[PDB]
């Protein structure tokens, strides 16, 4: 078995790096002063990047590769796409979801990501997707760390047996509690719905993820509801409000004023910038704005936040390779996170910060950790993204789980010439 | 007594149709296949439009042909006219206001309204109006069957017993059960007088129409507490918001979200087009907002919405005859349902839609029904709408109650030559 990882470079240090490994752990680290040679039992970077794995912070499991089935989301907006969604969940077979969960995550394997929180409606007397859903998370648990957000689609009090069925859902084992406050038919289920939500996961010992103010309505303020309850619980690391795309649409003044409080709380952020570009700005003709929650403020202040795919190929998004690379290069883009560092450091959006939105307790390259790492053919974040690179060696446990021989190209010129599009 | 309608043109159908009546009601409803012959007992409709009575599902009679007493309403706001009504509200005597009242409903009949709900102001702990309007109910049955709305103009939190008030209205007969939550103190107050007017129309089995969000305020969204209330009772088609003018000012975001519960609660729509266009965007300059809720969306929808007159000569209306085909063509001027088809659909919102806001059970041309109608001298929606025709015959219990022989109009050119304003 692998012994060590050579030639390595780290985001934020300088030169190459060592990484040491035992019994399935990193053992040590050490700076190198120069190339080291390859040998037996060592995975040489080649002074590629090496990190730990990306993370998916934010999926739809259940309704991936279902996009069309039985119609297609005309408007482009989550609205319609729950209704679509709802056609499809009548349809919905144990099998069904288990082999679609599947195919998503093998590309996700394929790409790096070693973490997945899947959100799975319960808005379902039969927990048809989440009954399949316990079944792929210990399939899939020698590649994936599976959580799984209870997410109560229709509403918690908006639907028939909502709350019941969310305390199913637990008692069943889904890792998180999920909500959705702004779908919610009036404010006051809206705030009464995440106090259940909270009383839920102190009762279960629960992780907390809300998909939070989706919608471009600049009164829609469920997330101070969400921090003021985690900041009194004292559990803000466990909590998580995703989306808040209300939040591109709040004046500056309430927005200076909530993210007191946004950073005393402690809890996480997910923003979904290739889902959010498209079903934001939907009822507003021209200027349209661009939807995404307010990711360069947050950085600034220090506020954890992170970014996740959605959806692949589902009601609300028709395209996805569940490329996190991708996720980023568009966030960025959208954000306008677009000088040189703010590209660099766009890896964290898509590992570390994620890695703390999920509370993952052996993550990171560090002596003692799980050797749980990837391989990127890139000289550091800002190549790595420029150049859309494949993960060349995804390891877990000490062992290569995942491997891409990258693309040959070559320009037959005067005299043929390979391109790697670097500099 | 009349036995037969003849040479009938109805709504939707192609053709001539003959309407048999026995013992007050409709009998048996079949199709001609050309022109009948005239004859004793049969009323000739003469190919024009046979539909079932206007109705007039929002007029306040206890204020009718008070304009400008003591003082007239200034700035031409909803503001202003509650505080010029409460100068005149002093003043009231019993028979000032059956008067009144029974003036406009004269009018009423006239114009082929069969069908009208009153709003009635119960914040006065004499109740005059309300004891008046009993009795004109009473008198006015043989010709207009005429609901009361028990409604706290001032507020049921905000005005000194105004809880016990509207009670005591509801216990001396009122038929239905008002609030106007955006005229109260706070959007608490707002919020808790709905609880209270949903538990008040429980104990007495009695409808509930609400003055709902009558405001140029983004922010007044008592509507969804009204729907949310209904759908929890399962009692939609009891329910009523009336104006929702602040809808015409909401983000479309909020608005696609609220429209889900709209559908699902059942509630019906009030807009008032001569007022709204009247009160709404005075505090605007320029550009000034429309101010009608959204009536093409709702009709786009299969939300029940349909218009009343509001104002007949009173604090917040300097004008009207009571004309249902006048109120009809502003609003479809206002809500841009210009097309051929929504002119000529157009009658629905002054009859079948209005019939079902007020939940009638005894209302249609069909067979088993009471053989209540009218006839308009025009061929079809579309052309009653543009010609503004009067009602040339009003039938109730199988007789004629109103006739209008209509205006006689010649130009002397080198010959007189009639002119009927049809193409
Ligand atoms: O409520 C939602 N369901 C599914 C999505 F993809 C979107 O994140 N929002
Ligand atoms: O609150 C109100 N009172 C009277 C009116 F005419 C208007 O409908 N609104
Ligand atoms: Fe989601
Ligand atoms: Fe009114």
């Known amino acids: 078995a692998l012994q060590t990882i050579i030639n390595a470079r780290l985001p934020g240090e300088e030169g190459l790096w060592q990484i040491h490994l035992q019994d399935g752990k990193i053992s040590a680290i050490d700076a190198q002063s120069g190339v080291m040679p390859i040998t037996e039992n060592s995975l040489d970077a080649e002074q590629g990047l090496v990190i ?34 709802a056609e499809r969940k009548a349809l919905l077979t144990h099998d069904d979801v288990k082999q679609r969960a599947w195919q998503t995550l093998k590309w996700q394997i394929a790409n790096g990501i070693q973490h997945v929180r899947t959100h799975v409606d319960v808005s379902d007397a039969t927990l048809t997707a989440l009954k399949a859903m316990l079944e ?29 069925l969310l305390e199913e859902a637990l008692r069943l084992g889904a890792d998180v509690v999920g909500a959705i406050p702004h779908f919610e038919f009036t404010r006051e289920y809206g705030v009464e719905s995440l106090h259940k939500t909270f009383a839920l996961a102190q009762k279960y010992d629960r992780l907390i993820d809300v998909h939070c103010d989706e919608i471009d309505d600049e009164q829609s303020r469920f997330v101070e509801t969400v921090a003021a309850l985690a900041h009194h619980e004292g559990m803000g690391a466990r909590v998580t409000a995703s989306h808040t795309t209300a939040m591109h649409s709040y004046n500056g003044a309430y927005t200076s004023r909530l993210f007191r409080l946004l950073k005393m709380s402690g809890i996480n952020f997910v923003a979904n910038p290739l889902v959010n570009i498209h079903l934001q700005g939907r009822f507003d003709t021209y200027p349209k704005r ?15 936040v992170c ?20 996720v980023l290069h568009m966030g960025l883009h959208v954000c306008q996170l677009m000088g040189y560092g703010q ?23 560090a002596a003692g950790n799980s050797a749980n790492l990837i391989i990127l053919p890139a ?24 491997s891409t021989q990258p693309a040959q190209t070559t320009v037959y010129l005067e005299q043929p010439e390979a391109i790697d599009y670097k500099r």
């Open 52 to 85: 730990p794995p990306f993370v998916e912070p934010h999926i739809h499991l259940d309704t991936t590769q279902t996009a069309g089935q039985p119609n297609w989301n005309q408007s482009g907006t989550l609205f319609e796409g729950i209704e679509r969604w």
């Open 343 to 365: 590209i660099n450091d766009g890896l964290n959006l898509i590992t570390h910060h994620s890695a703390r939105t999920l509370n993952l307790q052996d993550y990171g390259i």
């Open 136 to 164: 792929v998370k210990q399939e899939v648990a020698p590649w994936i760390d599976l959580q799984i957000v209870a997410f109560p689609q229709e509403g918690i009090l908006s639907y028939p047996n909502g709350e019941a």
């Open 379 to 402: 000289e550091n974040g800002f190549d790595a993204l420029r150049r859309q690179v494949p993960v060349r060696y995804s390891v877990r446990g000490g062992k290569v789980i995942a």
């Open 290 to 304: 661009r939807g995404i929650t307010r990711v360069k403020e947050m950085l600034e202040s220090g506020i954890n």
């Open 307 to 326: 970014f996740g795919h959605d959806g692949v190929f589902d009601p609300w998004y028709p395209l996805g390779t569940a490329n996190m690379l991708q």
